[PDB]
Amino acid sequence: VNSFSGYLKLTDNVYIKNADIVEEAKKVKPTVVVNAANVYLKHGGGVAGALNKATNNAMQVESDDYIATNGPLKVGGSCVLSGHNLAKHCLHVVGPNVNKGEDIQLLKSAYENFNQHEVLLAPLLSAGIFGADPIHSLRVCVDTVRTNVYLAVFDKNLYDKLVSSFLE
Ligand SMILES: CCNC(=O)c1cc2c(N[C@H](c3ccc4c(c3)OCCO4)C(C)C)ncnc2[nH]1
Numbered sequence: 001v002n003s004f005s006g007y008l009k010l011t012d013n014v015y016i017k018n019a020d021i022v023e024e025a026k027k028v029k030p031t032v033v034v035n036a037a038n039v040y041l042k043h044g045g046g047v048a049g050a051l052n053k054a055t056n057n058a059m060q061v062e063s064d065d066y067i068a069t070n071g072p073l074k075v076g077g078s079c080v081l082s083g084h085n086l087a088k089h090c091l092h093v094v095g096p097n098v099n100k101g102e103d104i105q106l107l108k109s110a111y112e113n114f115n116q117h118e119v120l121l122a123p124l125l126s127a128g129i130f131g132a133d134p135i136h137s138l139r140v141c142v143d144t145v146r147t148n149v150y151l152a153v154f155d156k157n158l159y160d161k162l163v164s165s166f167l168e
Pocket residue numbers: 019020021022036037045046047050123124125126127128129130152153154155158
């Protein structure tokens with residue numbers, strides 16, 4: 001149903017909210033929820049652990065069967081699988097982990113995957129323990145994504161910093 005509410009409009013197609021992506025998925029019932037994935041789809045930590053626990057591990061069982069046959073994704077790549085109880089589909093997107101020395105330039109490729117979908121609920125890619133500068137990730141999002149993206153950032157201090165910086 002894509003019933004998004006309470007978002008700050010940053011550009012004609014990018015929106016942001018201080019919210020838990022799991023609670024947004026339950027309220028909004030989106031066509032697509034984006035997971036902040038890693039290449040072998042191990043859904044621990046961060047957004048991935050939160051989404052997988054909210055599916056009672058159904059996402060991890062489906063992801064393990066996908067990886068057994070298809071092997072890992074690449075950094076910057078993505079994979080559509082079921083959204084289970086949270087969405088129609090989950091778009092698993094791998095941003096670079098700069099705290100592990102991955103290439104920050106591939107963050108543009110990671111966001112480009114969003115352009116195959118008319119509307120998405122998503123986290124801020126490569127943030128948290130992946131180490132990218134959040135202000136930089138929001139700029140790459142705004143400059144790359146053309147479809148309608150609703151960003152849920154579950155940290156009030158980070159959200160207030162991003163909004164203040166974007167409005168400069
Ligand atoms: C109570 C259950 N819910 C949650 O624990 C939860 C965590 C959430 C989150 N985390 C951000 C993040 C964004 C990209 C990430 C990442 C972490 O980890 C590493 C890979 O990339 C963080 C910067 C605030 N963003 C949005 N909704 C979230 N919900």
